[PDB]
Amino acid sequence: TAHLSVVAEDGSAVSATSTINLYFGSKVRSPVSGILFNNEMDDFSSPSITNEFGVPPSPANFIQPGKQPLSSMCPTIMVGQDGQVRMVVGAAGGTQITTATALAIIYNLWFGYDVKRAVEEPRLHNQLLPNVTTVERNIDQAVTAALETRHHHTQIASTFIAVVQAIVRTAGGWAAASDSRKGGEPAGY
Amino acid sequence: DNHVYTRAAVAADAKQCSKIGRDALRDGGSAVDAAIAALLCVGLMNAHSMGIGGGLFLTIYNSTTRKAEVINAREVAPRLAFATMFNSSEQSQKGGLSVAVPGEIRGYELAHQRHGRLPWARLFQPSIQLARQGFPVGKGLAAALENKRTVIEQQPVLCEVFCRDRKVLREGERLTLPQLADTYETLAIEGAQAFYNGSLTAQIVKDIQAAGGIVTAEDLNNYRAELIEHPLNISLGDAVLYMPSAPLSGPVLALILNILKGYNFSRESVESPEQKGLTYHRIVEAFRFAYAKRTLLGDPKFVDVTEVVRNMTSEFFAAQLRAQISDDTTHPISYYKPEFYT
Ligand SMILES: *[C@@H]1O[C@H](CO)[C@@H](O)[C@H](O)[C@H]1NC(C)=O
Ligand SMILES: *[C@@H]1O[C@H](CO)[C@@H](O)[C@H](O)[C@H]1NC(C)=O
Ligand SMILES: *[C@@H]1O[C@H](CO)[C@@H](O)[C@H](O)[C@H]1NC(C)=O
Ligand SMILES: *[C@@H]1O[C@H](CO)[C@@H](O)[C@H](O)[C@H]1NC(C)=O
Ligand SMILES: *[C@@H]1O[C@H](CO)[C@@H](O)[C@H](O)[C@H]1NC(C)=O
Ligand SMILES: *[C@@H]1O[C@H](CO)[C@@H](O)[C@H](O)[C@H]1NC(C)=O
Ligand SMILES: [Cl-]
Ligand SMILES: [Cl-]
Ligand code: NA
């Protein structure tokens, strides 16, 4: 998955998330065209496949001809009451996209972290099933303790949680951040 | 650089692609032209993540009409697909049967018809160059290549571009994509119709069916990107947030933030370990409640989600969930009422 955020000079904006699903999608590459084909059918629920221990199939998300599979993607644009763009934000990282996107927004809009900090700040994730709270390696350990004494079982992600790209309007203009977890970098004028 | 820009900004997950988007802006392109141009580049530099073999959504805001729209160009199950086609994760994840009908190119075309200022061909030009000349493998792709070393190395068609002496490329080594370059060129000149009802179409169908898939020409001919003129929105303070509804996760996001807005978080919320700990606990509980409701979501054309989404975007409903968040403890799964039917 890749997330992209754009603000133009006229204040117009695009938030765009795109995916072939898993790494190299289906692993089917055309030798003639070079096109690498998605494995998006894997985002449907299937009655014969158990993913998580104790998690049943979701009938709302079964395969039907012509149907689109449920997605965690959430490309977002925040606009001010005055009609000016305030934030352009989204993420990659499967079911972690939605929590990561919420965090970027919370971090900037409520905690008052600038966009780079909002993107780099350690994240965490809980999706109810499974019954575990995943934290990034460098999370404030007062957070870990606050969760554990409240009975959350926590575990540390072996890599990182999601990948966020964001732009936020500031005093100095448009501040942009690409997530160092994947190594992108912004560009502008 | 600090990356604060006076006039325009592109944030992508590869530097070269952010620059390509920025250059399109600088040459007079709309926000959409820059995004399309950047996306064609990410399809190359992060070939493992996205590209013309997949699908996307665009949330687009016009600062003149002050209207937001969404473009739905996510893949669709082929006409021959059915509920019980797979019996193992392996069947749904690997090979042609795992392939859904790609929407990406129809999605660029629709966004561009509505918002483009640069010519279609100009959007592809710098990516055509990049794929022919090559680029150093970046950090993300290097990691993906490592992760999937086994399958890559044993499949000749993938090792063809993704290996160096039968071994997966590593960070800093040159990756070239000469067939995609040709394909991007065709797309640039012949237009989207080349993919869906044109010179690329039969080849696509043949690649997918050779690997055991069931996508046919009719599937491609039939694919349509969709304009959504009324995206989901929620109100936060003086701001509105535009995001896609089902089949994407706007409703999940909306519910997370609506639950949380009632706590009135501020920089104080994180100033002491006492407050910070409670704050993050509250966050995690809102995640839990929000994902409980997510299992009802699905393609709104096949599933009636009108009221599921009404609830998830409703502040009162979020207030009802916020009141079940205990400040001193988390709860067992059933506390959050995850539902699998209605
Ligand atoms: C799985 O099982 C169903 C029902 O027996 C059958 O229709 C289908 O073709 C099988 N698919 C695969 C990929 O094994
Ligand atoms: C926004 O709307 C204006 C006026 O209708 C139009 O000229 C312009 O093309 C639109 N901007 C974008 C980025 O599509
Ligand atoms: C192009 O379009 C028509 C129907 O839309 C179809 O009959 C024809 O075979 C298509 N051509 C290709 C190459 O898919
Ligand atoms: C938010 O939701 C719906 C869109 O159909 C509508 O009630 C309202 O006009 C929307 N708000 C904005 C600012 O578009
Ligand atoms: C929506 O939430 C209400 C509680 O506010 C509940 O009674 C109702 O069952 C829900 N409706 C749907 C369609 O899920
Ligand atoms: C899940 O974790 C919570 C948090 O401690 C715990 O109360 C519960 O017993 C666990 N199991 C289930 C099925 O919810
Ligand atoms: Cl990304
Ligand atoms: Cl190639
Ligand atoms: Na930055």
Largest interface: A-B, 132 and 163 residues
Number of domains of chain A: 1
Please state the second-level CATH architecture of chain A. 4-Layer Sandwich
| CATH fold type of chain A | Glutamine Phosphoribosylpyrophosphate, subunit 1, domain 1
Kindly, what is the distance between the CA atoms of the first and last residues of chain B, rounded to a whole number of angstroms? Answer: 52 Å
Give me the Rg of chain A, rounded.
19 Å
How large is the count of helical segments of chain B?
16
Question: Which strand order do you get reading across the main beta sheet of chain B?
Answer: 3-4-9
Q: Number of domains in the coordinates of chain B?
A: 2
Order of helices and strands of chain A: EEEEHHEEHEEEE
Glycosylation sites (chain B): 62, 87, 197, 233, 264, 311
Protein name (chain B): Glutathione hydrolase 1 heavy chain
Disulfide bonds (chain B): 17-41, 159-163
Extracellular side (chain B): 1-342
